[PDB]
Design a binder for this molecule. Structure first.
Ligand SMILES: [Fe+3]
Ligand SMILES: [Fe+3]
Lengths: 186, 186
């Protein structure tokens, strides 16, 4: 039942049509985890969203999963954005992937190539793993790991390209900042 | 090896840049099939129509399923509208789905309720009722039902309506294939 957003608005090249339609795809609906849900019919009452995954129902009560995934997404982004360094996480990826061009050109067979909707992610169990999970009802926080970066590849995460749309993750999304917010290592 | 369509990209309920993109999402995009068919082996070299759905274990391979769900659908929408099943077809619904008024308002459910990408399908086995197929390239053909009334619920199914799936289908898509070959002869 939150009201995320800030840092962005017009966020360079991913529009305000797409963004405050999409920021609302997440918080008009999704923030639906409550109505004839939490309080409403399927239970859980005292939870943190963080606490929804692991314990909770299924897909219907995994719209609550959508809220986390999205307000996560929104803090993983651009508008002052760029490419890794600033420490060990640099060095992490650089020996797991081995490189970053490599990292960015692998983290796609994550994203691009997953039949349907969901999100690709940068994850860490106790060292890094690039995890598929494209179903919506996929947050690697169900298991023994926690996400460094996400990307909604659900068809409305984008559209501003339409006949031929990969340049969405590429020629649209690698102007991702919060390499400072993705900086996570433990 | 598909190149056809029942009419030209619409006009009044489903745009021209719906039928452009959706039909080629279908086309030169779902060309993934032909890429991994005879080429190496699978046992899918031969096997009639999409007998590759029934045998097939998908995603990239259950592309077969997707060629099909899309070609199924094509026939399902026609400029010739009339949410009026004659009364041969009318019978098998005006006894199952309450009535037809009550079939539609029940096909809504399954269609909007298919959580992110998927379908709402009207089948027949030798036990009758509707169907929600929420996992991607779906299809009732592995289960073995065999009339079919399609739809498409993927977000690419609507550049029109934006987030408004229902206005799109429980609205717009009551322009079903004149219940003649929806009307069953097999
Ligand atoms: Fe989204
Ligand atoms: Fe489709």
């Amino acid at each position: 039942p939150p009201l995320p957003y800030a840092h962005d608005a017009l966020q360079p090249h991913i529009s305000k049509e797409t963004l405050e339609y999409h920021h609302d795809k997440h918080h008009n609906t999704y923030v639906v985890n409550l109505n004839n849900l939490v309080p409403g019919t399927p239970e859980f009452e005292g939870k943190t969203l963080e606490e929804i995954v692991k314990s909770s129902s299924g897909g219907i009560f995994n719209n609550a999963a959508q809220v986390w995934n999205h307000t996560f997404y929104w803090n993983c982004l651009s508008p002052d954005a760029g490419g890794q360094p600033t420490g060990a996480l640099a060095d992490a990826i650089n020996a797991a992937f081995g490189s970053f061009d490599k990292f960015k050109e692998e983290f796609t067979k994550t994203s691009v190539g997953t039949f349907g909707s969901g999100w690709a992610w940068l994850v860490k169990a106790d060292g890094s793993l690039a995890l598929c999970s494209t179903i919506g009802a996929g947050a690697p926080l169900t298991s023994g790991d926690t996400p460094l970066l996400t990307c909604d590849v659900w068809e409305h995460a984008y559209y501003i390209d339409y006949r031929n749309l990969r340049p969405k993750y590429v020629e649209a999304f690698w102007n991702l900042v919060n390499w400072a917010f993705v900086a996570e290592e433990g």
